Design a protein around this nucleic acid. Structure first.
Lengths: 201, 102, 121, 387, 48, 51, 431, 42
RNA sequence: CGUCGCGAAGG
């Protein structure tokens, strides 16, 4: 169902549960092992996640093995559970690529060694007028991402990449450096769906 | 002619000379006066005795003008010890805060 | 409530609570019993309204004595929660004095209310 | 260790969810609402003034919208989209309040009653150009209707024969409230209280099988209200004072059936439990009506003060579980209170919700849709997940 | 009739009295040297 | 007292206890020099270098 | 990793040893009675002999201390050192100190107990290394100069780290910071392991039960509007409500009753755990106050059920147990008390189960239904089960008595129930 | 006595303007027309 | 029937 429970057999008890590591729809937690002698578990489902979870040493010095901390998060690797819709190469170095997925998510993947495969977070920056943000307050993900555009000319100084979503009346940018959404979406000002974005080099 | 007086002057009824010299120069007027030797502002600690001096002056005004102006009371002290209970749990719930960030 | 001397009727209660609403709009009143006695001693109060709904009535009827000494008009109203909701405070007040400002915008209704209060002694 | 009063320990070790989370509740979970947005109800066709009144058809999926831009539209509404069906436009006359009406007996009338700040109200008939009538004739009492600015619509069984017909009810000018006839337009009676009529609401109560007496409850501007039945001639059967409250501005009864949710069968009528009188100091007193029956000076079951400024619209849920307070003064000025425990819903009306200057609010009869119309000229549509 | 049965079920539901943040901070004054039954019906007084 | 001050980011270490058995002085071949009590946890002179 | 960390490890591992005179006076001036300038000149025999007098006074007011006067307060114990022996002996002396502290946790209003335990604070260094048993064995006296002295002497273990702004400060810590200490669940597990060790040693007393109950109800009150924290916090408070109910004293019994009723009103629990908690609080009812308190918690805990099954049949294995531990008589008197706590859903399920499982005492259901007020769907449901009962067995006179009561009140409801099932003419032909 | 009375009037108007200037900085959804938005101080 | 700025169960 997606859940992962730790039983304790010297007390027949439940140390800690862990809810929704891997999503239930792709199978939930498929294989979740300890390591021989080590207090870290490695979990992988079918939704292209692979996490490891460390147990802390006990917090009470005298009693010890009856107050066990919940397992902390640690190093993880991850795809995005559905085939990607668009592919871009960020830098001229051929080091980082951008994958626009089909589960409505944008990721930055590495090519050298896979330590830095990370999702660009969809926390919208505040609109610059002094008032509150646009869009959904609840973190539901964006629409399906059709066509994007990418260059490295003035990276970091302002918004770098832009993209165009499925049947969305505007096309919104991101930032390659901060790895999140930029401020200004551009409407198409004609009441039409956006299909083809590009950027000056 | 004590019941015909507000809670603020029942608070500062004692130390009026420090009050008036603090008013006619530029200082800050006192807060306990004659109620400082009561049994509850000594129970409080810090500036909690200042806050308790104000709330106990207000309840002293309530109780005082009740049993000075009523003409049918049984002299049992009912709203007296009721106001004592209210001042006491007010004192407890204001000393129970801890302004040191834990 | 036998010691509650003059308490208003329905229509007079309604018109004085609308004028105390306009007083709280224009910020021309001081609310609360001890504040009422403060402004009565320093002699600014046009009139006093007081609520005959508190469990002692002697918490307020000490200000009638100096109010009679200073000849100010004073009148009771049967609901302290009405006093609170009409004075603009989320707590049930007891007494309210209306301070004196001849350059107001509600001077004539304040004075008509003042005559309707001082007529019933 | 092994080779195999302990009851709840064994079942704590068995299960690891600890609420009856499912549909096996039938009640609103208190202090935590479950509510989603939907598409904007005024998206397929833009409006132009403040949406002064919203309503629903009591059986059909039609959301009726009317404002100060002297038009009235009727949308067909659902989740992903919503479209316009018709949009009548009355030149010359705005509409301060406009509402559906279905007759109780035949269920095939479908009138629209639309009234503005002028002296006339307009009656539209719906059976699918289209005709309307101009109710403009008070018969005997023309010096008691400065305007038709506020009205209601309510059923009446005539108590010597079961000729159930509708009635519109108008706000007077001195202390009057006239009733009329919905179809014909005769005067029937005019009741009157003192002070100023500020608002009023319609209770129903059944008497036997297929027979019911209605009750008009009307407030003063001071707080003593009159409740008089009008299935006989309108004379007062009870008069009682609000415990507190001075400048009161709206009253709404319900929980059973009322204007926002009438019935279609006559025997599906129901005595309304909750009553809610709301002031201009933000305060809302709400009573039950199983202990305020003959008390003549009852106690408020709750005295909410959660929203600050002068409240205008307070509605109920169609089954009587969620009250909605809405003050038309400041921005983002709507709240929902869980009515049986009289708690206030914490999670939904937060600052990340675009309520705007709320000036109308209306519940759906059965879908749990919640329409909020603001001043900028749109109406947003939330859906409550529980219903 | 079934809708009337369910609506009667949700009408017949009395006013509960919830718990909140400082619902029991008053117990820490009379915590000391009180019999357990007196503490229990004091808690039931605060609840009901 | 049977300690193990295991350090890995500087090189193959080296010991010198003091003349009396109180203080300890350890030295990595990369840059690390630490003079410290060892029966008490009182690190009183740590210094990295780059030689 | 960090050499500073690997040295602070051995610092906290060898804090209980003196390697120069300054560390000896810093580790010796920590005393429970005297201040620094007098406790820094106390030889061990002095505090030992006044503590032996203290233990003798404590023994002649409490008969479970002659074993300690034999073993741990012996004459050779002034020369027994702490950290010169082997780890098996240090573990044995460790749980010896634990046994002493949770034996003498209930005596801290006495100068003999203070001067007695000062000796093993001074000698066996329990102000440093056996720290947490001392803290959460004397935690309940938190408004006391003995607790302020304990907290100034001791260093804080990392669980109690929100007390650290009350060392060297003459105000005792507050109830709100005690609740902020009880809030985080990784202290709460440790405190519950202490509590059930105290239960199984049977030293539970009416001060620390009161303190534990008030802390648990305020923790539940702090998480009143935190659904995730309450869902995580149920199997701690409930599990030791269970192994507190498995004890025998009426104090700990109705303390578990109190945490049970406040948790049930805090969130709507599931029907099966409400039934099992009712079976648990009912299978071990002994004393007199336990009866009244268990009845009130059964009534309120069963009332907080908003969802179907909320008025269903309570099953047989707990219903006959309820009939055993509570008579049908004095349920009448609890109903006949004046203030009438809200018990409608439990009274309804009681009526449905006495109708469906006993079917031989119906004067009782007539009497209690006559003397309680009842809600309309409940009375519709009990007359529906009563019609099922009347058509499964023969119509006796008490059955037609309470049926004509249900005719004399709410004619429309019984006629609507019979319109759902048949016809009143056939019903009157049956009766 | 007349000089006392003009001192009374002058101190009255000084306390008037100074108390208004102190009262203008408390709170309130204010606007210079000096009136307040009618919402009760919670 | 002449009558009268932004904001999908927080920032």
């Amino acid at each position: 169902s997606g859940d992962l429970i730790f039983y304790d057999l010297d007390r027949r008890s439940r140390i800690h549960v862990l809810k929704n590591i891997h999503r239930e729809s792709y199978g939930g937690v498929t294989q979740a092992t300890f390591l021989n002698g080590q207090p870290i578990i490695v979990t992988s489902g079918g939704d292209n996640s692979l996490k490891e979870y460390v147990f802390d040493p006990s917090l009470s010095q005298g009693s010890g093995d009856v107050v066990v901390q919940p397992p902390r998060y640690l190093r993880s690797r991850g795809g995005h559970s559905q085939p990607p819709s668009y592919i871009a190469f960020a830098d001229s170095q051929s080091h980082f690529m951008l994958s626009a997925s089909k589960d409505r998510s944008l990721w930055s993947f590495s090519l050298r060694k896979d330590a830095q495969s990370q999702e660009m977070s969809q926390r919208l920056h505040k609109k610059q007028d002094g008032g509150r943000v646009g869009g959904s307050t609840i973190k539901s993900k964006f629409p399906e991402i059709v066509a994007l555009a990418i260059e490295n000319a003035r990276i970091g100084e302002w918004e770098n990449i832009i993209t165009a979503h499925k049947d969305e009346k505007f096309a919104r940018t991101w930032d390659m450096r901060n790895k999140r959404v930029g401020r200004w979406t551009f409407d198409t000002t004609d009441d039409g769906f956006v299909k083809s974005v590009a950027m000056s080099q | 002619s004590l019941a015909k007086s507000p809670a603020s002057t029942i608070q500062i009824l004692g130390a009026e000379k420090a009050l008036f010299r603090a008013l006619k120069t530029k200082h800050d007027t006192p807060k306990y006066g004659l109620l400082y030797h009561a049994s509850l502002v000594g129970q409080a600690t810090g500036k909690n005795k200042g806050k308790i001096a104000r709330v106990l002056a207000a309840k002293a005004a309530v109780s005082l003008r009740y049993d000075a102006l009523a003409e049918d009371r049984d002299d049992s002290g009912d709203i007296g010890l009721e106001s004592r209970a209210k001042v006491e749990n007010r004192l407890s719930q204001l000393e129970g805060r801890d302004l040191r960030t834990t | 409530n036998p010691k509650a001397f003059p308490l208003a009727d329905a229509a007079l209660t309604q018109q004085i609570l609308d004028v105390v609403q306009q007083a709280a709009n224009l910020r021309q009143l001081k609310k609360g019993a001890n504040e009422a006695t403060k402004t009565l001693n320093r002699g600014i109060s046009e009139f006093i309204i007081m609520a005959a709904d508190c469990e002692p009535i002697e918490i307020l009827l000490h200000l009638p004595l100096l109010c009679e000494d200073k000849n100010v008009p004073y009148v009771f109203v049967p609901s302290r929660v009405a006093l609170g909701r009409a004075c603009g405070v989320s707590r049930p007040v007891i007494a309210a004095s209306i301070t004196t400002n001849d350059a107001s915008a509600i001077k004539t209704q304040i004075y008509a209310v003042k005559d309707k209060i001082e007529t019933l002694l | 260790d092994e080779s195999d009063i302990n009851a709840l320990t064994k079942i704590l070790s068995t299960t690891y969810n600890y609420k009856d989370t499912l549909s096996n509740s039938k009640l609103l979970p208190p202090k935590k609402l479950d509510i989603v947005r939907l598409k904007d109800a005024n998206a397929s066709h833009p409006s132009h003034s403040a949406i002064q009144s919203l309503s629903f058809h009591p059986s059909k999926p039609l959301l009726l919208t009317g404002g100060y831009d002297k038009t009235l539209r009727i949308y067909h509404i659902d989740g992903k989209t919503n479209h316009l069906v018709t949009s009548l436009h009355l030149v010359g006359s705005p509409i301060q309040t406009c509402t559906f009406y279905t007759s109780l007996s035949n269920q095939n009338q479908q009138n629209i009653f639309t009234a503005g700040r002028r002296r006339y109200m307009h009656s539209w008939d719906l059976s699918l150009t289209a005709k309307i009538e101009k109710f403009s004739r008070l018969y005997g009492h023309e010096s008691t209707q400065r305007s038709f600015e506020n009205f209601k619509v309510a059923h009446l069984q005539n108590s010597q024969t079961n000729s159930v017909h509708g009635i519109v009810l108008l706000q007077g000018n001195n202390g009057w409230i006239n009733i009329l006839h919905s179809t014909s337009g005769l005067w029937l009676m005019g009741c009157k209280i003192e002070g100023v009529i500020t608002d009023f609401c319609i209770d129903y109560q059944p008497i036997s099988r297929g027979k019911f007496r209605t009750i008009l409850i009307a407030v003063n501007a001071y707080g003593e209200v009159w409740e008089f039945d009008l299935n006989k001639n309108g004379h007062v059967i009870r008069r009682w004072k609000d415990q507190g409250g001075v400048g009161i501005t709206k009253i709404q009864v319900g929980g059973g059936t009322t204007t926002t949710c009438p019935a279609l069968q006559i025997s599906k009528i129901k005595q309304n439990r909750w009553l809610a009188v709301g002031s201009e100091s933000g305060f809302v007193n709400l009573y039950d009506r199983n202990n305020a029956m003959t008390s003549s000076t009852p106690t408020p079951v709750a005295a909410l003060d959660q929203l600050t400024t002068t409240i205008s619209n307070l509605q109920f849920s169609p089954d009587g579980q969620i009250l909605c307070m809405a003050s038309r003064a400041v921005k983002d000025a709507l709240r929902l209170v869980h009515l049986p425990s009289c708690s206030v819903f914490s999670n939904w009306p937060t600052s990340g919700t675009p309520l705007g200057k709320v000036t109308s609010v209306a519940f759906s009869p059965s879908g749990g849709l919640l329409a909020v119309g603001n001043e900028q000229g749109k109406v947003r549509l939330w859906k409550l997940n529980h219903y | 009739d079934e809708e009337d049965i369910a609506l009667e079920f949700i009408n017949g539901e009395k006013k509960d009295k919830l718990v909140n943040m400082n619902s029991f901070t008053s117990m820490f004054d009379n915590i000391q040297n009180v019999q357990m039954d007196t503490f229990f019906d004091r808690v039931m007084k605060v609840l009901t | 007292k049977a300690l193990d001050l295991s350090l890995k980011e500087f090189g193959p270490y080296h010991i010198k206890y003091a003349k009396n058995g109180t203080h300890l002085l350890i030295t990595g071949r990369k840059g690390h020099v630490a003079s410290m009590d060892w029966r008490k946890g009182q690190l009183r002179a740590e210094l990295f270098l780059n030689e | 990793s960090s050499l500073s960390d690997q040295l602070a490890q051995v610092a906290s591992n060898n804090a209980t040893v003196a390697l120069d005179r300054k560390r000896r006076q810093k580790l010796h001036s920590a005393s429970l009675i005297y201040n620094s300038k007098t406790a820094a000149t106390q030889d061990y025999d002095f505090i030992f002999e006044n503590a032996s007098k203290a233990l003798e006074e404590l023994s002649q007011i409490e008969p479970k201390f002659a074993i300690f006067s034999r073993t741990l307060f012996s004459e050779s114990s002034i020369s027994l050192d702490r950290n010169v022996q082997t780890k098996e002996e240090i573990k044995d002396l460790d749980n010896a100190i634990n046994a002493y502290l949770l034996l003498a946790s209930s005596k801290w209003y006495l100068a003999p107990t203070l001067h007695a335990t000062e000796w093993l604070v001074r000698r066996f260094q329990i102000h440093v290394k056996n720290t947490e048993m001392l803290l959460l064995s004397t935690l309940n006296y938190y408004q006391t100069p003995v607790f302020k002295r304990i907290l100034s002497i001791i260093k804080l273990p990392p669980l109690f780290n929100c007390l650290s702004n009350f060392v060297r400060s003459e105000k005792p810590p507050t109830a709100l910071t005690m609740i902020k200490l009880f809030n985080d669940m990784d202290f709460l597990k440790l405190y519950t392991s202490y509590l059930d060790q105290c239960i199984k040693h049977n030293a539970t007393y009416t001060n620390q039960l009161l303190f534990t109950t008030c802390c648990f109800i305020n923790v539940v009150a702090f998480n009143s509007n935190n659904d995730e924290k309450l869902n995580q916090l149920v199997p701690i408070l409930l599990e030791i409500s269970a192994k507190l109910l498995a004890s025998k004293s009426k104090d700990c019994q109705i303390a578990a009753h109190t945490i049970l009723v406040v948790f049930a009103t805090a969130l709507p629990l599931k029907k099966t755990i409400i039934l099992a908690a009712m079976e648990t609080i009912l299978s071990n009812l002994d004393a007199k106050e336990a009866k009244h308190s268990a009845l009130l918690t059964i009534c309120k805990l069963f009332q907080t059920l908003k969802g179907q099954g909320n008025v269903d049949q309570l099953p047989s294995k707990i219903f006959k147990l309820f009939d055993s531990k509570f008579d049908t008589v004095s349920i009448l008197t609890f109903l006949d008390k004046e203030d009438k706590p809200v018990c409608d859903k439990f009274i309804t399920s009681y009526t449905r189960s006495i109708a469906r499982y006993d079917r031989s005492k119906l004067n009782i259901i007539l009497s209690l239904l006559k003397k309680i007020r009842l809600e309309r769907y409940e009375v519709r449901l009990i007359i529906t089960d009563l019609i099922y009962l009347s058509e499964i067995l023969e119509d006796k006179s008490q059955l037609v008595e309470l049926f004509e009561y249900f005719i004399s009140i709410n004619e429309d409801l019984v006629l609507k129930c019979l319109k759902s099932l048949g016809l009143t003419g056939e019903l009157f032909e049956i009766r | 006595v007349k000089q006392h009375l003009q001192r009374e009037t002058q101190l009255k108007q000084v306390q008037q303007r100074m108390d208004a200037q102190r009262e203008l900085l408390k709170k309130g959804s204010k606007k210079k027309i000096f009136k307040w938005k009618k919402q009760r101080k919670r």
